[PDB]
Design a protein around this ligand. Structure first.
Ligand SMILES: Cc1ccncc1NC(=O)[C@H](C)c1cncc(Cl)c1
Ligand SMILES: Cc1ccncc1NC(=O)[C@H](C)c1cncc(Cl)c1
Lengths: 304, 304
């Protein structure tokens, strides 16, 4: 009973968080095996951030200029390299708390947990979704850079995000663990506007199934629709177009509840056209889009 | 920038989660030092739960009947006792992952993180508030019993909740770590109705300050009010009466934003009387009450 915005247990990621200092800049690093991963803008002074030449800035940096501290102990830096927008600091000690891990580049609409950190120390954990415009709506302050996004499959941690910057609109941008930014963002203190933030339709549908599973059924109606009819409504409300791939992934939820995917689309259609009329769904007064169909199945079944 | 329902990093609590089996019932336990804490209804069969006599049921139980498994290794049970609604299983090994900890009995309106577990394994973490009617709106399924609620102050884990049951309304009830239930609930499969769930006024105000801090200011108005005038409105909308203690705790937020507590009460008053008019505050279309003033300060400052 009940449905919550749930994050993965963060322990496996906490054991990887370190502090990286370069000059007078301090941010977070991720220590996996004998490598420390961090945003390359750690080599920048706030003045350098206006228009940085990272290759030229990195020439003036030696292994001894990168201070890596894990808890209270110093790690010895024996190598350094730049991979896209991340720095890889080879250290002489493999992290003994290295969990089973993978680096994955997620698709927009997918969800993940963020372990927000400051000075290599964890402050909190929350569940996020990579928006369709490739930004994340996080909670990050100065010093949070290098905090990572991840998913967990039993004992394996799939790292998918590393925080790099805050856009002037207060939304967040970052990279995968290979240093490639999600979206068109560059690691530069220049105004970068985000594109249209559309709603993750498949996720809203997944959450509507979660609501039915937990007792909130007022929104179920006597109607059905088609993929094309629904998508006309989805376009008007800046919802992502729904495809047969999306319908396919909603299959287990449709099977559990006995509510056909297109009937749920018709419930969503009427909700979009008429609003909630002062009512709530799973304690929310708006349509939630940060639960994937996989998240709903996992939470509603108790996968650990 | 940004404001999220953030949970504490769960690592310190994950290291304490164990599986407790008694007969054919399996639930979670909390292993701290050489003691395992779990709901006493682990000794019950589903038939026993209808009207259990825990003292009589525990007579038929020996130390060897309690199977405690930490990860994949078995702990030897050398003692057992009942303290209110919890069982304390003395084991022969102190948990090496025991963090610095305290047992605290929280007040309604206070928040905490929950590490939902099944078979001694963590599935996820979320932030909760103890409702004024002493229930929690969690996400728990069968097997989640023994999952704990906690807060963290730097390196110290304050355990405040242990999950015991789901009311017929889908809301959750449980105890502090001394086994005393929050609210009037008993550990019996008997219909127990919850009282009125009022809104945690001080928390909504704290969240309104968080919204101002993060840029959402549309709700600020040209009005002020008094504690008595505001409380007349609070009573009509089933909001908890605001006291000078509440005003005192909002002081740092009032000081940071330059918005007097009573002016923020007047913004809240108008929001209660006129609704949000289709608008949102911190991405929410309703007034959020599961952030205390301490949570807002912690998140808006980056305490780790
Ligand atoms: C201030 C802040 C708050 C939240 N998240 C990240 C930050 N830090 C930043 O946004 C820093 C100052 C930055 C600027 N321009 C480009 C990059 Cl890659 C990085
Ligand atoms: C089914 C379930 C779901 C979520 N949370 C707890 C549960 N378990 C329960 O509510 C159990 C069956 C229970 C019954 N009556 C009294 C107590 Cl103390 C315990």
């Amino acid at each position: 009973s009940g449905f919550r915005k749930m994050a993965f247990p963060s322990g496996k990621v906490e054991g990887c968080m370190v502090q990286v200092t370069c000059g007078t800049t301090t941010l977070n690093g991720l220590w996996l095996d004998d490598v420390v991963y961090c945003p390359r803008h750690v080599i920048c002074t706030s003045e350098d951030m206006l228009n940085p030449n990272y290759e030229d800035l990195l020439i003036r940096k030696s292994n001894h200029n990168f201070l890596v501290q894990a808890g209270n102990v110093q790690l010895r830096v024996i190598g350094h390299s730049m991979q896209n927008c991340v720095l890889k600091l080879k250290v002489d000690t493999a992290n003994p708390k290295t969990p089973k891990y993978k680096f994955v580049r997620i698709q927009p609409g997918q969800t993940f947990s963020v372990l927000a950190c400051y000075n290599g120390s964890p402050s909190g954990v929350y569940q996020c979704a990579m928006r369709p415009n490739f930004t994340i709506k996080g909670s990050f302050l100065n010093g949070s850079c290098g905090s990572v996004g991840f998913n967990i499959d039993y004992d394996c941690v799939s790292f998918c995000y590393m925080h790099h910057m805050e856009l002037p609109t207060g939304v967040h941008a970052g990279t995968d663990l290979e240093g490639n930014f999600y979206g068109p963002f560059v690691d530069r203190q220049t105004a970068q506007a985000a594109g249209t933030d559309t709603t993750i339709t498949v996720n809203v549908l997944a959450w509507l199934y979660a609501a039915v599973i937990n007792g909130d059924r007022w929104f179920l109606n006597r109607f059905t629709t088609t993929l094309n009819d629904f998508n006309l409504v989805a376009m008007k409300y800046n919802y992502e177009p729904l495809t047969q791939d999306h319908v396919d992934i909603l299959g287990p939820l449709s099977a559990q509840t006995g509510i056909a995917v297109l009937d749920m689309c018709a419930s969503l259609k009427e909700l979009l056209q008429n609003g909630m009329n002062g009512r709530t769904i799973l304690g929310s007064a708006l349509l939630e889009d940060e639960f994937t169909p996989f998240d709903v199945v996992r939470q509603c079944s108790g996968v650990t």
